[PDB]
Amino acid sequence: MKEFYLTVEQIGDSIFERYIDSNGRERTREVEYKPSLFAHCPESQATKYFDIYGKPCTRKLFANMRDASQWIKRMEDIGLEALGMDDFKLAYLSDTYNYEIKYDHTKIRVANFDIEVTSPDGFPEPSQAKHPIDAITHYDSIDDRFYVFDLLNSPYGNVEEWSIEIAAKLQEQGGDEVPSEIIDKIIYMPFDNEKELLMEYLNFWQQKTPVILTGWNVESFAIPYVYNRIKNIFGESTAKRLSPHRKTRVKVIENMYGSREIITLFGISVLDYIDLYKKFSFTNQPSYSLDYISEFELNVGKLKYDGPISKLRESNHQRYISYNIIAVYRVLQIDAKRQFINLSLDMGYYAKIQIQSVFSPIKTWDAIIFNSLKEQNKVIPQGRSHPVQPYPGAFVKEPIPNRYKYVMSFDLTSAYPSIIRQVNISPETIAGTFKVAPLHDYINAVAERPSDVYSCSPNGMMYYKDRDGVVPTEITKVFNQRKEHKGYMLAAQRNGEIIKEALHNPNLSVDEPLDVDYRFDFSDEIKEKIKKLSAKSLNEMLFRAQRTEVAGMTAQINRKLLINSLYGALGNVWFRYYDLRNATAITTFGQMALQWIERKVNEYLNEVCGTEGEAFVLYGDTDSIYVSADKIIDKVGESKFRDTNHWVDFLDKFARERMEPAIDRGFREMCEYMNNKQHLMFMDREAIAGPPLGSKGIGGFWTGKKRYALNVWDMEGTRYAEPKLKIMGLETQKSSTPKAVQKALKECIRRMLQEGEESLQEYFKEFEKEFRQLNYISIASVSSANNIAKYDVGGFPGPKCPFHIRGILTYNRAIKGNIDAPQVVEGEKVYVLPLREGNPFGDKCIAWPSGTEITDLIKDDVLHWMDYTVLLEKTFIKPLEGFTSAAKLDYEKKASLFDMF
DNA sequence: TCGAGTAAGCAGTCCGCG
DNA sequence: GCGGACTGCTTAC
Ligand SMILES: Cc1cn([C@H]2C[C@H](O)[C@@H](COP(=O)(O)OP(=O)(O)OP(=O)(O)O)O2)c(=O)[nH]c1=O
Ligand SMILES: [Ca+2]
Ligand SMILES: [Ca+2]
Ligand SMILES: [Ca+2]
Ligand SMILES: [Ca+2]
Ligand SMILES: [Ca+2]
Ligand SMILES: [Ca+2]
Ligand SMILES: [Ca+2]
């Protein structure tokens, strides 16, 4: 097999590389890599190396990496550009793996671990590590085993061994319900003392050294705790054994307020699953506790226990160990579904970077572009410093707030990447500038043609047309991968809808789910077999289809993220190819494209409707238009349609056969106007929206920019078994809005769009009457909590104190003195509740850590003093009043003459 | 919240507005 | 009471 790296590091003048050799075995090597860098030279000097602008360079070969770094510094002292890849390990990977890497994941040791630390006096700080580590569960992907290290004797209690038999039993048997599928995979090791536990863990780690190291909060908690505890007991040299090269660095990480420490383990790639989840999941969660996320992702019940976690080991060591094991398993289950490790490996090997660098699109793209240029013997420019400067973005149309009955939407496929490719925007394709007219003049096609030679953006920039830039070339490659995965995702989605339909008529039989590839649209034969299947088999198939859809979603949306982040990197001062001229060329072209096509669509529809000045485009944001279809439906007449699906078909056909060709003609003209390299503006239909045929539903409404709801029957070619709400920006979509309130507002919206005013009024009246019975967590607001210290003046709110921070200060006074009470962590999320006048907490609100029950010390009093009236008004009535006033509906029945009878 | 970008919405504070 | 200046937070692209 072809060799591939596992990890790479620079340590002084050596590269340390762990790799898989041609026989599939893990090896390590130290290489005295001599890096090269480059300086500009005279034309009279014969060279093969040129910078991206075509200027000749001489290659400087250094005796070692330190010599190279020193040269860069002296070049700065002289005032001359030092060209080339200054991150020497990326140059090493490029030289050592000069081919497309094919990796074999089965050979990569992926370790997933979690530790337990009993602490009586509050949160056990990793930097201090003052308490014994009393459990470690470490799952190894190569062995497929859970290695459990269990401390039986501690200063906080001596306990009996954990029992695998009880662990396996149902909770109704007094057991722990450790999943039966992992029972046989547990290797249990009890220890009489912590010193032996840790020495054995280190010997184990040496034998089975992680390449990828993951878990939940492993980077911020488990790793620094283990390192520091070992350091405290044995000394630094022993703790450094967590690195295969015995090198570690305390790394200080900082944002806007304050900083924290992590331990860099040289020769390991730490991908903390909480951070993978945050970057790649496209959620914003009220809580990031593993319990909360596991419940959300997997629909598994919260791991229940009596009393605080600080007393769990002494009171129920059995459950304590089983819960540690289950926690490790939960992360593996989340990864089986979301596949973020697979994503990271794919992206990392594609770019030829340390796998942990997938968190940085700047590093990822720097490596991709360097590798690409190096292939042509071209030399990358030196990174420079730039001051942070603002630049303009997208155009968003101001919608008239209203109900909108029939709507068809359209938006550009990968808009900004497509603009980059179409215009040929790249650092080395800049050709010059032209005199800019006001944007309105380009939108209306009255400005003079920018260039008859070069490809243009309405910000004034011109680009070469003779050859593709490296940015267009490389962005296209990732875009093509994105397109492939999106195809699989949508097929799985369409397949899911087939199963949902079949589930209306399940067969009374005993059978099996069909063995199929959900990434491909079901054949006629498969469809026929599905119609004969039982509910059990159909539901299993649906689950599998939905898992395939999620897998495709991860692969496609994060490739979309990668290419969109190349655009974004052009506007980040740390990117080697930072250039506000190029970032603004993209955004200004975007503004033109949207407004140009708005004009074209309005013109087209006015023509086919025989009107003048009618605005068919009611809204658009960045690269999208929303077209009112009322007049199209009315041209045929509603009574002509057999059912909802009939008019959906009709609008679908109209969009595909009439609208899209008109849109395409419009953009081709724009391409010619701007003299672009290639027409790539592809504005495909997104949604077909409207009320159910014959209902009183309003179909859709807008309240403002970035705030709307549509009742959708077809989304990008997926014809739903049941209509689905597309809601953007409204409170149902915000993580700050209480859970039960999101749910209620969504049902209000459903009723508005599908059923009408009277249905809405019925539901509202019921919710208002019953909501005080809702569990307090479900009606609590959520907020991130930054700068608690800033607004804390002797335990009381300082000037301009935010509402949620005020709540935290209230909480802090109420739990004062107790080291046992959960502390609100700076920068994390809190639940927030309003409190009635005269309450014993002495302020108008209280906040506590999100994803948790408020501590028993104050729970009863919070429950007694919760201000339900304020809750309802702020979170439910105010937003609902917004939706209904926009839609020109009333959520409460107004008086009429009929009342008199 | 270490980690690519801008536009733009709403909650809340402070305080004017005769 | 609402609206502007401002902070804080969050979402649509
Ligand atoms: C979602 C998103 C969009 N954008 C910008 C670039 C996008 O091309 C543009 C339009 O956003 P989208 O319409 O959300 O995405 P897209 O057009 O790139 O891809 P597709 O519609 O095919 O799924 O907005 C970002 O810069 N960052 C982002 O995270
Ligand atoms: Ca735990
Ligand atoms: Ca788009
Ligand atoms: Ca599309
Ligand atoms: Ca059937
Ligand atoms: Ca869009
Ligand atoms: Ca009490
Ligand atoms: Ca206001």
Contacts of residue A203, defined as CB under 8 A and 6 or more positions apart, other chains included, come to none
Contacts of residue A272, defined as CB under 8 A and 6 or more positions apart, other chains included, come to A214, A215, A216, A217, A218, A219, A220
A412 alpha carbon to ligand 6 midpoint, in Å?
7
Ligand approaching nearest to the C-alpha of A625: 6
Q: Which residue has the tokens 């809005």?
A: A737
Q: What is the dihedral of CA A124, A830, A860, A800, to 10 degrees?
A: 110
Helices (DSSP H) in A504-534: which residue ranges? 524-530
Residue A153 CA distance to nucleotide C1 C1' (Å):
66
Task: Judge whether A559 and A365 are in contact, CB under 8 Å.
Answer: no
Distance of alpha carbon A118 from alpha carbon A124, whole angstroms = 8
Is the CB atom of residue A284 positioned under 7 angstroms from any atom of strand C?
yes
Q: Determine if ligand 1 sits within 6 Å of the CB of residue A415.
A: yes
A31 - beta bridge partners? Answer: A15
Residue of minimum CA distance from atom 29 in ligand 1: A561
Tokens of A303: 């791991």
Task: Judge whether A882 and A703 are in contact, CB under 8 Å.
Answer: yes
Tokens of A36: 């090269």
Distance of alpha carbon A843 from alpha carbon A814, whole angstroms = 11
Task: Judge whether A764 and A891 are in contact, CB under 8 Å.
Answer: yes
Q: Which residue is nearest to nucleotide C8 (CA to C1')?
A: A802
Please indicate the experimental technique that yielded this structure: X-ray
Distance of alpha carbon A504 from alpha carbon A535, whole angstroms = 9
Nearest-nucleotide field for A832 (CA, C1'): B11
Assign 3-class secondary structure to A717-731: CEEEEEEEEEEECCH
Other beta carbons less than 10 A from residue A215's beta carbon: 26
Q: Which atom of ligand 1 lies at the shortest distance from residue A568's CA?
A: 26
Residue A891 CA distance to nucleotide B3 C1' (Å):
45
Tokens of A401: 């707030």
Nearest alpha carbon to residue A715 among A705, A707, A727 = A727
Task: Judge whether A49 and A129 are in contact, CB under 8 Å.
Answer: no
What type of residue sits at position A628? Answer: S
Other beta carbons less than 10 A from residue A707's beta carbon: 19
Residue A278 CA distance to nucleotide B6 C1' (Å):
21
Distance of alpha carbon A798 from alpha carbon A782, whole angstroms = 21
Q: Which atom of ligand 1 lies at the shortest distance from residue A563's CA?
A: 18
Helices (DSSP H) in A711-828: which residue ranges? 739-754, 757-770, 803-814
User: Could you tell me the strand order of the sheet in which A269-270 lies?
Assistant: A186-191, A145-151, A135-140, A110-116, A212-214, A269-270
Contacts of residue A793, defined as CB under 8 A and 6 or more positions apart, other chains included, come to none
Is the CB atom of residue A742 positioned under 7 angstroms from any atom of strand C?
no
Other beta carbons less than 10 A from residue A489's beta carbon: 21
Q: What's chain A's length in residues?
A: 901
Q: How many Cα atoms are found within 13 Å in the side-chain-facing hemisphere of A692?
A: 14
Distance of alpha carbon A781 from alpha carbon A832, whole angstroms = 5
A533 alpha carbon to ligand 5 midpoint, in Å?
6
Contacts of residue A327, defined as CB under 8 A and 6 or more positions apart, other chains included, come to A114, A137, A216, A290, A303
To one decimal, the resolution in angstroms is 1.8
Domains of chain A plus CATH, in order, are 1-108+340-382 (3.30.342.10), 109-339 (3.30.420.10), 383-468+573-729 (3.90.1600.10), 469-572 (1.10.287.690), 730-774+867-889 (1.20.1280.300), 775-866 (3.40.1820.10)
Nearest alpha carbon to residue A419 among A461, A387, A380, A447 = A461
Ligand approaching nearest to the C-alpha of A394: 1
Residue A551 Cα to chain centre, angstroms: 14
Q: Choose the residue to mutate in A414, A482, A587, A683 for probing ligand 1, maximizing ligand atoms within 8 Å of C-beta.
A: A414
Task: Judge whether A167 and A322 are in contact, CB under 8 Å.
Answer: yes
DSSP E strands in A268-341: the ranges are: 269-270
Q: How large is the angle between the packed helices A340-351 and A312-338, nearest 10 degrees?
A: 60
Judged by DSSP in three states, A628 sits in strand
Task: Judge whether A423 and A454 are in contact, CB under 8 Å.
Answer: no
Assign 3-class secondary structure to A6-19: EEEEEECCEEEEEE
A628 - beta bridge partners? Answer: A407
H or E element at residue A659: none
A518 alpha carbon to ligand 2 midpoint, in Å?
37
Distance of alpha carbon A5 from alpha carbon A351, whole angstroms = 12
Distance of alpha carbon A380 from alpha carbon A862, whole angstroms = 61
Covered bases, chain C (protein CB within 7 Å):
7-13
DSSP E strands in A326-454: the ranges are: 378-379, 402-403, 407-412, 430-433
**A196 to A55, A236, A529, A882: CA distances (angstroms):** 63, 17, 59, 64
